[PDB]
Design a protein around this nucleic acid. Structure first.
Ligand code: SAH
Ligand code: MG
Ligand code: MG
Ligand code: MG
Ligand code: MG
Ligand code: MG
Ligand code: MG
Ligand code: MG
Ligand code: MG
Ligand code: MG
Ligand code: MG
Ligand code: MG
Ligand code: MG
Ligand code: MG
Ligand code: MG
Ligand code: MG
Ligand code: MG
Ligand code: MG
Ligand code: MG
Ligand code: MG
Ligand code: MG
Ligand code: MG
Ligand code: MG
Ligand code: MG
Ligand code: MG
Ligand code: MG
Ligand code: MG
Ligand code: MG
Ligand code: MG
Ligand code: MG
Ligand code: MG
Ligand code: MG
Ligand code: MG
Ligand code: MG
Ligand code: MG
Ligand code: MG
Ligand code: MG
Ligand code: MG
Ligand code: MG
Ligand code: MG
Ligand code: MG
Ligand code: MG
Ligand code: MG
Ligand code: MG
Ligand code: MG
Ligand code: MG
Ligand code: MG
Ligand code: MG
Ligand code: MG
Ligand code: MG
Ligand code: MG
Ligand code: MG
Ligand code: MG
Ligand code: MG
Ligand code: MG
Ligand code: MG
Ligand code: MG
Ligand code: MG
Lengths: 31, 102, 214
RNA sequence: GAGCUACCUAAAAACAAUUUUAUGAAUCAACUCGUCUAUGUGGCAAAAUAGUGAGAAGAUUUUUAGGUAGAGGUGAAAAGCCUAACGAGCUUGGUGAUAGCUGGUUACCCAAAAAAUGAAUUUAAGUUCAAUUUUAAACUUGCUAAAAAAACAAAAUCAAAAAGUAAGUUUAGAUUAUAGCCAAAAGAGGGCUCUUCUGGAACGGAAAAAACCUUUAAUAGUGAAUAAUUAACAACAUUAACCAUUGUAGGCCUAAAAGCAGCCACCAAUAAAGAAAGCGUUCAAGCUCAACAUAAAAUCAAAAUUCCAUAAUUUACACCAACUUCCUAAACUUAAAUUGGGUUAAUCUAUAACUUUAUAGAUGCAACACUGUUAGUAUGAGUAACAAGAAUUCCAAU
RNA sequence: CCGCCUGUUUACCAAAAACAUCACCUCUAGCAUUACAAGUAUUAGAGGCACUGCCUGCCCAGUGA
RNA sequence: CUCUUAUCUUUAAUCAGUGAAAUUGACCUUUCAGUGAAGAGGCUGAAAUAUAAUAAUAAGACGAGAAGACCCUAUGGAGCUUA
RNA sequence: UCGGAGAAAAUCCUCCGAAUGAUUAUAACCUAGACUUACAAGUCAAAGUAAAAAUAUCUUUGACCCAGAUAUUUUGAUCAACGGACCAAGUUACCCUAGGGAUAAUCCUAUUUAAGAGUUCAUAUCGACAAUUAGGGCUCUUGGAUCAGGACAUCCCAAUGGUGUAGAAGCUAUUAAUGGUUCGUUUGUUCAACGAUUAAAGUCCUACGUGAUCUGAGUUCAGACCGGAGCAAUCCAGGUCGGUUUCUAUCUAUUUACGAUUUCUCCCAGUACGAAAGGACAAGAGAAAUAGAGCCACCUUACAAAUAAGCGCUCUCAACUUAAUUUAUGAAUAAAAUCUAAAUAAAAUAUAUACGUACACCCUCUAACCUAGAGAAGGUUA
C-alpha cells in the first residue's frame, strides 16, 4: 500500500520525468 | 432490501377462463354417421364447449399426414362409402367374443 | 444448517447451571451432581464399602465414589473402599480406580473378569447409569433399557452381597410395572427418586432399593 | 369525602333435588367467584362477550341504616384498599412556587466582528478573572524587515541604521464567548489519542461534492480577453547441426560399489574424450553432456436486484470555458453570537390641515413557526359503522 | 416436587409453592364503672411456628461417698 | 398433523338512507447502478413512460398511535432502613 | 495539594520526595528600582539610620470570620475533597419530573518458493523455513412457520485432463448456476450428538431476507421462594414457578400462456477386462417418483340438489447460436514439426428463442337465462 500523493505533488512528478535523447539514424541500418 | 415487489409476483386473482392446449392425444375411433371423434384422455373446458382440433405438432409425429387425406376428405366424390364406425386395431370392439388372456 | 430441534437442545446446554458448576468443581460432566444430591438424602455411600459403577464413561460418577468410600486412601484413619468402572467407551485414567473399557456387561466373559478383580468376590452396592443410544422411538428405546436392567437383576444374585443397594437409571413407559415386580421380591423396599439436576422435560427416573436378601 | 372499596356495629333475609351421615362431607342447580382458550382492542364494555372451569349449610352469600379520615384510617401483608389516575386521597389558598434543563421571542438599511487559548470553582449542560473584540477621546510612532554580538546548546527570542509602507500606545465605557470540523506537515503514547506550524468554508472545476483546486466587494448590458479543469496512449531490445575409442571396474571395512554411495587421487594414449557435468543401473550395464570435424543467427519496462454515457486510432499547434479582469454607465472591495449608527408601518393627544396631510408629545406600537389559545373549514371519506319476521280485507286489524 | 386439609390475596397483565389455619412454643400483666371487660393466671395481650410419633438430649463443683 | 376439502350463518361486494377516527410542510408522488451518516420517488449518469376509476396483496415510505423498556446527567424529588 | 528527575512545551505517561530537622557567634528599623502573578499569595535589593566590630547555613503548606494568651505583642486545622459549607450515611425492580443519548493478531482459502515424505522418483498425492499492492471470516439479540430474490468459492445431475488409472472402486485438477437438495429424536458431549434414508441431504449474501403476515425464548420488571452476602432497608451479568402492544392501507410497487428434471429394472452380458476373485462402457426398451398444465366415464368425500374436490384419471417437445477439451490441413522455423490470441476445416456441458404452438374478428343489446362473473365486462335467443 502506497500512501496517495496530493494531486499537486502528482503533477510535479509527471513533468520532471526522465527524457532520453534519440539518434537520427539507427546504428544497425547504418553501414 | 429491494423496497418493492417484483413484477410477476404470485398473488390472489381471477383463475381459469384461459386458452390451453393439450398435446399428443391419440384417436381411437370415428363415427361417420354422426361425425363423432374419440380422443384419448381429457380436453380443456366444460361440456357443450367448442374446441379446435388439428394434427399433432410434436417432433415424433412430424410427417404422418401422408397417409391421411391430403387436402381433405370429400364424400361428394363418392368413390366408396365409408363404414359407419372406424376403429383402431388395438381397440376391442363391442359384440366381439369375450377376451381370454391366453 | 442446524435444525430447530438441534438449536433448542444446544441453548439449554449453554444456560445450564450444573454444567458450569462441574467445570468449576473439576467434575467431568453434570451427571456427578445427581449422585451427590441423592447420596446426601439417602447416605447410600459410606466409607469402607465396595462399589461397582456401570456405564462409567466419561467417569464423572466414579470421581464421586472414590472420595466417599475413601478409595483414594488419603485419609489413613478412614476405612478404605473399592470402586470399579465398566463402560463400552474408553476411560482416561483416574486415581484410585480400575476401568474395564471396552467391555459389555451382557457378555459372559466380562462377568468372570469382574468376579476375580472385585474384593472377596462380592460388591456391597452396584451403581448403574447405562442407557442405550436413543433411536427416537419411545417404545423401542424404553423397551431395550428395561431389558438391560432386568438382566442386571439376574446377575445381581452372583455379585451382589446381602444387605446391598441397587441404583439404576431408567425411562418411563408401558413396561415399568414389571421392573417394580422383580425388585420388590429381592429387596425389602424400593423408591422412585427423581433428582432436581435431572432435567424436567426428560422422562428419566431412578430406582433406589436396599437390603438385599436372597 | 367510607352511597366505590377495607374492616366493624345493629336490625333483617336466602339455600332445590340426590347420596352420606350427623358434617368448614359428597354429586349438582339457584346464587357467589373468575382457571384456561379464542373473539374484541376509539370495543356492546375506560376490563366485556362466547365457551370452558372453582365453591355451593358455611371462615357461606345478600339487603337496609350507622362508625373509623390523610403526620391518618383499614389490612387472613398484595407496601392491597380509602369514589375509574394512592410508595400515600381530593379541593381551595400560600402561588406569577422553583427549574444552571426543553421550546418560543413580531419592520427596513448601513457598518464592524469573534475563538471554541490560560486560571479558579460540590466545577466540567454553569459562572468570575485574564486574554481577545469593540465604540469614543488624548497624542506619537507602529507593521514587514532586521546586520553584526550575544544568551542557547556547539528557529524561537533580542531590534541600529535603512527601505516598502499606515498604523500603534494611553484613558473611559460595554457585552458575548470559554466543546469546533476536514485537508497538509513534525512529533509523542501503538488505527485511533494527545501537542505544535499552515490553509479552507463558489454562484466555476474534480460525476453528485461543508474542508481539495481556480477566485479582491456589488450593479445594469443580445460586448471582449482569460483561470482551474478524470483521464492516459507483450515481446524483443553467448547457439540450433553432430557425436563418441582407452590404460582399468581408479584405492577403500564398502560382495561390488566400475565417471558416477562414498573416499582421496584424479592422471593415459590418441588430432579428440573430464578417472565425468547429468540420468540409470543390486554393482555392472546401459542413455546423456562436454570433446571430433561441419555450421548459422546476435536488461526492465506501455460476490451476492440489472453491464453501465454514446462513440472514435491521423487535415497542419489552436478553440471552448467563472462579474476573475477590461469595455458603456456606475462602484471604490472577503459564515456568524455579539457590538455602533440612519430611516419607517399603525393608533392616540396638542396645534394645524380638509378625499386623508404637517411639526411635535406619547404607547397594550408590527408574527410563515412556542405538539401556543379560541373560532371556522378541509383531508382521511361519502369511507368504517348503524336498522324493520311474512301475506292481506290493514299499525291498539285478522 | 411443594404445601397438611375447607378458606384468603395484587378491583384493570401474577390465584400460587405466599397469607391465614387447628396443634405446639416464647414473652408481658395481681387488677374494676366507655375498649380489654360489667371480665380476673384453666384469664387477657404481644409474637413465633405445620402436626404426629422417632433417633440424637447435657455448663448438677470435683474426688472420696 | 401427513394434506386438505365440502356446506350453512356472520362479514364482504352491488342498490337505497344516515354518517365517524387516528392521520396530514407542499407534491405535477417511477426503475436500475453510483454517491452518502449500515440509509434516495426527489442529488450524478443511464433507462422507461397517453389519461382516469373499481376490487385485492403488504416489500418500502427509517409507515401511525406507543405515557412501551435499557444508559447517562441535575449542588431536581419522593418512599424505605439505620450504627 | 506542593517540589525534584525523563519523555521534551500534552498525559489516566515513567520515578523519588514534602507537610521538617540540625546547628546558629541572634540577623533592627526604614526605603529607590525590579522579578513572578487572572485575583490572592510569593521572591531580590542600592542609599539613609541604628546596634555591634556587615548575612546563620543547610534546602516544601492553609485565606476570611470567629474564639484565645498575656500586658500589646503574640498563638490556634491530614479545613489533606488541601481557594477551605460551623455541624448530615445507606438503599429503591414500588419508584417520579426535566432533559441528553440511544434503541493489527488469530484463522481458513488462493498464488510463489522447494528442504524433506513418497521402497526407487520434489511437484500422482502431500509438504518444513519462508514469501504473498494476496481474499475472507476479575467481568459482559437470536430460533421456527410462510414465501422466497441473488452470488459461485459446485453437494448431486453434465462435458473433460493427469494418476503410484488392469476391470470395479477411488484420490486430484479444469469448465458450467440447470433444477433439486428428506423424515423423526436427547442418557453423556462448551455453539455437540443419535436413528432411518437419499442420486444429493452444498457454502454463503440479502437491517434474525421476511413480527403494519403469524409465533417461541431472551432483553426483564410489579408477586413468591431457596443459595450466598448485608445490623437492616435491600442486593446478585446466581436456581426455579407465575406473568398486557394496538393498527379501518393515503402514496409507490405488485395481482392472466408455453416447448421437464431425476431415479430404478431389463437388454448389450457374467460379455470387455482379469491368473483368479471379481466386474463396465456407449446404443436400445419399460417402469416409476416429483414439478407444471388440465379434467370427472369410474372410485372416494361432501351439498342427505343437477355441482365442487382428491385419495381418482389424462398430457408434457425442438436448439440457429459454446468452454474446458480433442482431432485434420499448414507457415513463420531447411520437418516426416506444430489444433491456429497465423490465414483455415471439424467434434464437443449447462445455457437460450434464431424456430414454432396459443392469441387474431371489431362488435347488436329493452330484457331474460348462463358450466361467464365481487361490480363492470363476456356468451346464448324455433
Ligand atoms: N449394554 C451396555 N453395556 C455396556 N455399556 C453400555 C451399555 N449401554 C450403554 N452403555 C454405555 O454406557 C453409557 C451410557 S450413555 C452416557 C451416560 C453416562 N455414562 C453418564 O454418566 O451419564 C455410554 O458410554 C454407553 O456406551
Ligand atoms: Mg428500489
Ligand atoms: Mg427432552
Ligand atoms: Mg357502607
Ligand atoms: Mg353497596
Ligand atoms: Mg338443601
Ligand atoms: Mg375477588
Ligand atoms: Mg373439590
Ligand atoms: Mg364442584
Ligand atoms: Mg359443601
Ligand atoms: Mg411480601
Ligand atoms: Mg414487594
Ligand atoms: Mg381517586
Ligand atoms: Mg419560570
Ligand atoms: Mg486554542
Ligand atoms: Mg469546595
Ligand atoms: Mg451546569
Ligand atoms: Mg529601527
Ligand atoms: Mg469583482
Ligand atoms: Mg450575518
Ligand atoms: Mg403587541
Ligand atoms: Mg401557532
Ligand atoms: Mg369530506
Ligand atoms: Mg379507503
Ligand atoms: Mg370496502
Ligand atoms: Mg361495511
Ligand atoms: Mg330484526
Ligand atoms: Mg394449600
Ligand atoms: Mg381452594
Ligand atoms: Mg378480606
Ligand atoms: Mg390482577
Ligand atoms: Mg386456585
Ligand atoms: Mg388471573
Ligand atoms: Mg406461608
Ligand atoms: Mg351506501
Ligand atoms: Mg406522474
Ligand atoms: Mg440506489
Ligand atoms: Mg435520480
Ligand atoms: Mg408496505
Ligand atoms: Mg390488511
Ligand atoms: Mg416510525
Ligand atoms: Mg455541578
Ligand atoms: Mg436537593
Ligand atoms: Mg430541596
Ligand atoms: Mg544598604
Ligand atoms: Mg475541592
Ligand atoms: Mg480545590
Ligand atoms: Mg421483587
Ligand atoms: Mg430461490
Ligand atoms: Mg468454477
Ligand atoms: Mg415487516
Ligand atoms: Mg396459570
Ligand atoms: Mg416467562
Ligand atoms: Mg420471570
Ligand atoms: Mg389499494
Ligand atoms: Mg447400456
Ligand atoms: Mg510443412
Ligand atoms: Mg501434423
Amino acid at each position: 500500500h502506497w500512501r496517495v500523493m496530493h494531486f499537486q505533488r502528482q503533477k510535479l512528478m509527471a513533468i520532471t520525468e526522465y527524457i532520453p535523447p534519440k539518434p537520427a539514424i539507427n546504428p544497425r541500418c547504418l553501414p | 432490501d429491494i423496497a418493492r415487489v417484483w413484477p410477476g409476483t404470485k398473488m390472489p386473482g381471477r383463475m381459469g377462463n384461459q386458452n390451453r392446449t393439450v398435446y399428443g392425444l391419440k384417436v381411437w375411433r370415428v363415427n361417420t354417421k354422426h361425425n363423432i371423434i374419440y380422443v384419448n384422455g381429457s380436453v380443456p373446458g366444460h361440456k357443450n364447449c367448442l374446441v379446435k382440433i388439428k394434427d399433432s405438432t410434436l417432433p415424433a409425429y412430424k410427417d404422418s399426414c401422408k397417409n391421411l387425406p391430403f387436402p381433405t376428405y370429400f364424400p361428394d366424390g363418392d368413390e366408396e362409402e365409408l363404414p359407419e364406425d372406424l376403429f383402431d386395431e388395438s381397440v376391442w370392439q363391442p359384440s366381439e367374443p369375450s377376451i381370454t388372456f391366453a | 444448517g442446524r435444525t430447530g430441534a438441534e438449536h433448542l437442545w444446544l441453548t439449554r446446554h449453554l444456560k445450564d447451571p450444573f454444567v458450569k458448576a462441574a467445570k468449576v468443581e473439576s467434575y467431568r460432566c453434570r451427571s456427578a451432581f445427581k449422585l451427590l444430591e441423592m447420596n446426601e438424602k439417602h447416605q447410600i455411600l459410606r466409607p469402607g464399602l465396595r462399589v461397582l459403577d456401570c456405564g462409567a464413561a466419561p467417569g464423572a460418577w466414579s470421581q464421586v465414589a472414590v472420595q466417599r468410600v475413601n478409595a483414594t486412601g488419603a485419609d489413613s484413619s478412614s476405612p478404605v473402599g473399592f470402586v470399579l468402572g465398566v463402560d463400552l467407551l474408553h476411560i482416561f485414567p483416574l486415581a484410585g480406580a480400575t476401568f474395564l473399557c471396552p467391555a459389555d456387561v451382557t457378555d459372559p466373559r466380562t462377568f468372570q473378569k469382574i468376579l476375580e478383580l472385585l474384593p472377596s468376590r462380592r460388591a456391597d452396592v452396584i451403581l448403574s447409569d447405562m442407557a442405550p443410544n436413543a433411536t427416537g422411538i419411545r417404545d423401542l428405546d424404553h423397551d431395550k433399557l428395561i431389558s438391560l436392567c432386568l438382566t442386571l437383576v439376574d446377575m445381581a444374585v452372583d455379585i451382589l452381597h446381602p444387605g446391598g443397594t441397587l441404583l439404576c437409571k431408567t425411562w418411563a413407559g408401558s413396561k415399568s410395572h414389571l421392573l417394580q415386580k422383580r425388585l420388590t421380591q429381592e429387596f425389602q423396599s424400593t423408591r422412585v427418586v427423581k433428582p432436581e439436576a435431572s432435567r424436567k422435560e426428560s422422562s428419566e427416573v431412578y430406582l433406589l432399593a436396599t437390603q438385599y436378601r436372597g
